[PDB]
Paper text:
Two new modified Bacillus thuringiensis (Bt) proteins, Cry1Da_7 and Cry1B.868, with activity against fall armyworms (FAW), Spodoptera frugiperda (J.E. Smith), were evaluated for their potential to bind new insect receptors compared to proteins currently deployed as plant-incorporated protectants (PIPs) in row crops. Results from resistant insect bioassays, disabled insecticidal protein (DIP) bioassays, and cell-based assays using insect cells expressing individual receptors demonstrate that receptor utilizations of the newly modified Cry1Da_7 and Cry1B.868 proteins are distinct from each other and from those of commercially available Bt proteins such as Cry1F, Cry1A.105, Cry2Ab, and Vip3A. Accordingly, these two proteins target different insect proteins in FAW midgut cells and when pyramided together should provide durability in the field against this economically important pest. Taken together, these results support the conclusion that Cry1Da_7 and Cry1B.868 are effective insecticidal proteins against FAW that have the same pore-forming mode of action as other three-domain Bt proteins but bind to different receptors, suggesting that they would control resistance and increase product durability.
Cry1B.868 was developed using chimeragenesis, similar to the method used to develop the Cry1A.105 protein, a familiar protein that has been deployed commercially as Bt maize protected against FAW. Cry1B.868 exerted mortality and developmental delay on FAW (and other lepidopteran insects [not shown]) at concentrations between 100 and 34,500 ng/cm2. Its MIC50 of 430 ng/cm2 against FAW using gradient-purified protein suggested an 8-fold improvement in specific activity toward this insect compared to the parental Cry1Be2 protein. There was no detectable difference in insect responses between the Cry1Fa-SS and Cry1Fa-RR colonies for both Cry1Da_7 and Cry1B.868, suggesting that the Cry1F-resistant colony was not cross-resistant to either Cry1Da_7 or Cry1B.868. Cry1B.868 was also highly toxic to the FAW colonies, with LC50 values of 262 ng/cm2 against the Vip3A-SS colony and 43 ng/cm2 against the Vip3A-RR colony, indicating a lack of cross-resistance. Interestingly, the Vip3A-resistant colony was significantly more sensitive to Cry1B.868 than the Vip3A-susceptible colony was; the data suggest that this difference is unrelated to the Vip3A resistance allele, and it is likely due to slight genetic background differences between the susceptible and resistant colonies. Cry1B.868 at 50 μg/ml elicited robust membrane permeabilization in Sf9 cells expressing Sf.ABCb1, while only a background signal was observed when this receptor was not expressed. These results indicate that SfABCb1 and Cry1B.868 are a functional receptor-toxin pair.
Numbering used by the authors:
A (entry chain A), B (entry chain A), C (entry chain A): 54 to 301, 307 to 640
The structure:
């Protein structure tokens, strides 16, 4: 539910980024009070106690009362502001409505200022992280409304500016707090054994859904950088729990093997370029004690993964001996949105075996409404069984449609935890907003993270993301191209686009873009951080190249690079954006 | 003092219900800051520590600081708002006064929103109940001012509505919280012995004075339901402490007898129709040890009680043997407002006897300024003595007049706690606002609770009140009349009145009224709750019958009924109101 | 730093008292957010933990979170208000800027009301004293801005008055809280030995710098009493730590002697009239153990001190035998702003000796830019050494100039703690704002405390200050003159001035002033307190004598007196002010 709501909120903000036209602010605001201040329950205390249970450290009974009391009162005010904001909809002229809405806006904007430190208490920053992050986003949307149509509210140009300036610094402040405190929180649960890793990974996945995916949208509220509609991609991989037992007491981590440090390096893919799974091939082994107690469980797999117009990559995990047949499932261009998995446990004299004898992959074709299940199993009986529904961990956002139209995540990679007499698959997922084609729209600002590329230049490493960008990030230490991406355009192609790239660098440099590997458009831009400085939100600037360009084909490719600086300096690239000039 | 203030506040709100004309809001508001934010002391912490001592459970030193700090700051703001509200009195046109008063109104209305959860902390809801309830009333009066003359403030029709809507839902929210939490609080002090019953009853009486009597006036703030002046009656019975010893260690509850469960069923009258005492007859027994240590104490009484135009009822308690003479006092139509009682204790070898050898009943005639004492005693000497002044528990409201003009309660019933060698009278009182004649005014809305009736139909039970109505309530389970009341009208009788009755029902039904048991005016009205649902504030609606009527005599009688529904459903009636049409 | 900031703030308010013209409010406000809400650190928690360490009693981890969270949010709002206040600078006409600035002013003024009890928690009033006092001043400056130019904001005359009234009562409320709680705090650290006295004196000096010097400026915010520029003097003496050891464990207080009660009476000058040091003569004694371990340390001194046009006074402390030579330093009319002192420790078999073998007095001439050091030493080697820089305790205010132009305090008196084999000088200092000439300006209101006089009448005692005036105070118990002062005027002398004197009295009386001991101007004024009442902020009123006068000479003398009342009553005088009539 905690996770369910963070998905609904973050996924619905994706639709209302930059400048919205007409009346999606009010319906979004209306949706927002319904999800955040509902009848019946308090989702804030659900946030607070969700993280508290994760890190296994309860807030003081004090800090509890203070924040939630501040939160509901703020919700009475947020409900009041939107209520009247929902009446300004029809209003064109009134010296009283724009005078009360005036005051309740200003009061609540002010109210969020005082309230923000309340959810930011020393020694209990981490338990309040989701509570804090969801509140921080709320304040940043309201400052966006100052720029949006406060100009009609009865606000002066100077006060709009004063409002925009705090939105800028609050975007920097809120994006830093969440990143560091998500990191510190994650840091403390670093353990020494597997049981601590499950708690570690759980903290990572759940808070990535609520907090980090919201923070990554904060830059896209800026009215001046995104003066129209803009589109964003969240590119991080998240890992659902490994499919193993949990009851009655060996389980799956006390069934021998590996260490915390071993599991973390074995399942977490190092920072890569984003790929979609293609063909999956499962190998099985049979482990019986008699005619009534056997099960052929999951021992190894071979998964093909392709970047966007990439050459095929195939990884191998586990065992591959094929006395038993191997079953192969087909995932290419099909969104595996829901996996129902069964964790089997067979027992010998003292030694129990954990494996997976059944896993169904529900898939949808995002381009043309084709569904399907893909089943793996051989046979089993007399063994223990524990279900793993992916939607327990990765629910579709709450919609008026079924799950195969409303899902929020795809299967992207299957790793495998192996040991002596233990097999625990781990599904890594990628967010829906990260698309398969890098489609470039004609009437909105398309953000394409450089992580959506297919090829790295001979010196470009993908380094792990700071927290507040939505995914990992690419870093050159000397001049040259960064990565090679492929982009697709819609019906009418005559469109000219200017290029703008979110970068972080130690030096003034020349940033360029080449289309179809032939014609080039460059610019000169500024240093954004100090040499030993540790990459915060303000280290990132936008480098707008003046000159517009036409794409030659509906399927063209775009390179991003930066040279003309002395090596040893560090240059980062998060994202190239394409601004349709019109 | 805690109790003294709850009386002053609640009693003074009685005069300013519905729509006030001219300038009683400001003087009431001025009175309100004087009583709530005085110089010298903090009555909020007096509230808080009064309940804390009752339930014998102190708030955390934390929750203490938070709420009182919020409260005084709110009082600095409430003092500021009223200060300028007290200057708008003279103002007719000003774009600045109605612009500051504008802002400090809106700010404080908003301020109460955030503040309300502060006085509503989990695990300490009951100790803050009076603190909470008095604050809740404060917020609800200000929302009433939005409807009242915010229309002149510079408020638009839509924002007045938005203000009225929160007044509606806050009236529902605040009336539910107080009722349930008064009930939960009362529930925990349910004990097993008599010493726990005194603490139990003390909690009941004191919090009924401050909280419940205030909540019962919350419906009467609605500007649309009561668009003029309206009159309200509080009909509950409250029970002062039984007159027994308290020092040096047997006292009156360790002098043997009964249990908690025994006392509660023996003294608390089950839900009845309200009656006023008539003739009281005391019986006494003499208990001496010698010539220097005797006392004839109170052993039994016989009290006559009449409903409004009711047949005489006489109850009997205790002993009645009349070797000693019996003394009879006359209370008919006389408001016993003050009782000074003496708890006597005589001692034998080990067995002590508790009784009352002296009790004076100060009375006033509410129609024509006749006072008087009525004394009971026989003779006593050498025995212990402990005074019981009713005004210690039931003080008159703070006025510029003496107690026999400013009293807030009347004696209504005398029960008696009996045991082996123990006599402890208990005085039950009814609030002043509940009148003796059910007078119906020509220019205000007269609320007559159905508990002010004289006769029940053959299936109507008086069930115990939910908490937020002011008294108990009447319930039919099949169609027919509810109860039979008698009403009185003032000088000019030509007036036509329409009837409107606060009801709660499971089904659509026909609600009617008949005047003088002859002519009938009915209507059809809506279901208001679900079958198993537990009767909250929103279960109660108003059923307005369209047709006006003339009363035939200055002393007429009015029946309330509801038929045309299937039995097994439940129908409740709290109150019939009479709206003078003009 | 805590002390460093209290100096900067208080010293910079001295320049912007009463009514400022043009644009020093905004630059002062800009300075104020920089010093109070800086980047990097939280000076509020530095305040809070500074006092906490002094009294050796930490706030609860709770009260901590609450106040600082309220404080920064208030700082986000204070930064916002000043930000737009810093834009109204250029604005002359706008129905929107004066409408947002409108609302954020009113909101923050309201915000300070609720916030003030937050920093005033029961059982932790003293640790929050500096936090509280600095916040109290902030609120009082904003109320001053209501009177100043709220009249242009869009405020009505009546609301300005309502704003001024709270400024009056808040000036009374904040000045009382700080004085009593500074006193209670100081009271608890009353000890029995010398180690407790150092902690006692430390609490006195540090909180006098931050809190008391700020409170003494609160009266000078009143727009009606000081309708122009006004000048104020802070006249209290503060005492830096006695120069003794602190490491490795005898130190200087365990090296035998005296008690708490002995030290307090020996070093703290009883309430006197303010004097400036003149000629200082140090006597030394030699204490060696061999040729490699000797030191001639400070044993006694003889200091000349003169009031303003006073006869010379000379005090003597310590020893005076002159086998060793005596060194004499010249301080007359020279501001000893910085002293660097060395605490020496020589050791015998078990008995160690503490003395001072080196002390340099940096001085500046305030009239004409002459600097200089004045050194005392004889010779020392092989002994322990611990430096005492006065700016560790008494820093110059943070400026763009060096310390000999920006210092905040002068050396005024040197007392000496003596014992058997122990010498610990103690420097008493007077604040810079207290001047040497009592200069009277032509275009500002000059406050001259009566403590700046030179002669007391035959019945006038200087009694210790209540806390909220800036220094001690003079009290007559029968009619007559109070004290005799000398005043100096600037270039053009034609000016007429009216006299007004801050007094506190039990009776209606005649207060007079005589110039040059010849011509007299008197008036009749009102009782201000009750006979046994204990002198609070409201005990002090201003007695304005109607008639203007001319001073005859550039160096004239002014007497203040009050007769025509019955003896036994008490009459206090803090300050005579001189209002240039024009």
């Amino acid at each position: 539910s905690t996770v369910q709501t963070g998905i609904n909120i973050a996924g619905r903000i994706l639709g209302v980024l930059g400048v919205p036209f007409a009346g999606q602010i009010a319906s979004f605001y209306s949706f927002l009070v319904g999800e955040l201040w509902p009848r019946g329950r308090d989702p804030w205390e659900i946030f607070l106690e969700h993280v508290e249970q994760l890190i296994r450290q309860q807030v003081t009974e004090n800090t509890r009362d203070t924040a939630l009391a501040r939160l509901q009162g703020l919700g009475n005010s947020f409900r009041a502001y939107q209520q009247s904001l929902e009446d300004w909809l029809e209003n064109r002229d009134d010296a009283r409505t724009r005078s009360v809405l005036y005051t309740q806006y200003i009061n609540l904007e002010l109210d969020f200022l005082d309230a923000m430190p309340l959810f930011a208490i020393r020694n209990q920053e981490v338990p309040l992280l989701m509570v804090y992050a969801q509140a921080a986003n709320l304040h940043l949307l309201l400052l966006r409304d100052a720029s949006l149509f406060g100009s009609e509210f009865g606000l002066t140009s100077q006060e709009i500016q004063r409002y925009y300036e705090r939105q800028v610094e609050k975007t920097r402040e809120y994006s830093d707090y969440c990143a560091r405190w998500y990191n510190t929180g994650l840091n403390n649960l670093r353990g020494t054994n597997a049981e601590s890793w499950l708690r570690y990974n759980q903290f990572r996945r759940d808070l990535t859904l609520g907090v980090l995916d919201l923070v990554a949208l904060f830059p896209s509220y800026d009215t001046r950088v995104y003066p129209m509609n803009t589109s964003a991609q969240l590119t991080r991989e998240i890992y659902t729990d490994p499919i193993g037992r949990t009851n009655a007491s060996t389980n799956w981590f006390n069934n021998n093997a590996p260490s915390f440090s071993a599991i973390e390096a074995a399942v977490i893919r190092p920072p890569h370029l984003l790929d979609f799974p293609e063909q999956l091939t499962i190998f099985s082994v049979l482990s019986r004690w008699s005619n009534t107690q056997y099960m052929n469980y999951w021992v190894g797999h071979r998964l093909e993964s392709r970047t966007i117009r990439g050459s095929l990559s195939t990884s191998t995990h586990g065992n591959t001996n094929t006395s038993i047949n191997p079953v192969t499932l087909q995932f290419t261009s099909r969104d595996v949105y829901r996996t129902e998995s069964f964790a089997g446990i067979n027992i010998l004299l003292t030694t129990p075996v954990n494996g997976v004898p059944w896993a169904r992959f529900n898939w949808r074709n995002p381009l043309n409404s084709l569904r399907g299940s893909l089943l793996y199993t051989i046979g089993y009986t007399g063994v223990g069984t524990q279900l793993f529904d992916s939607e327990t961990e990765l629910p579709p956002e709450t919609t008026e449609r079924p799950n195969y139209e409303s899902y929020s995540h795809r299967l992207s990679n299957i790793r495998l935890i192996s040991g002596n007499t233990l097999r625990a698959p781990v599904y890594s997922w990628t967010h829906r907003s990260a698309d398969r084609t890098n489609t470039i729209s004609s009437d909105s600002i398309t953000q394409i993270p450089l992580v959506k590329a297919h090829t790295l230049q001979s010196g470009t490493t993908v380094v792990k993301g700071p927290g507040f960008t939505g995914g990992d990030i690419l870093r050159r230490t000397s001049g040259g191209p960064f990565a090679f991406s492929n982009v697709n355009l819609d019906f009418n192609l005559s469109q000219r686009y200017r290029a703008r790239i979110r970068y972080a660098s130690t030096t003034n440099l020349r940033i360029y873009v080449t289309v179809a590997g032939e014609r080039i458009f460059a610019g000169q831009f500024d240093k954004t951080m100090d040499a030993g400085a540790p990459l915060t939100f303000q280290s990132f600037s936008y480098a707008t190249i003046n000159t517009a360009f036409t794409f030659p084909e509906r399927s063209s490719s775009l390179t991003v690079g930066a040279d003309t600086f002395s090596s040893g300096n560090e240059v980062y690239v998060d994202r190239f954006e394409l601004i349709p000039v019109t």
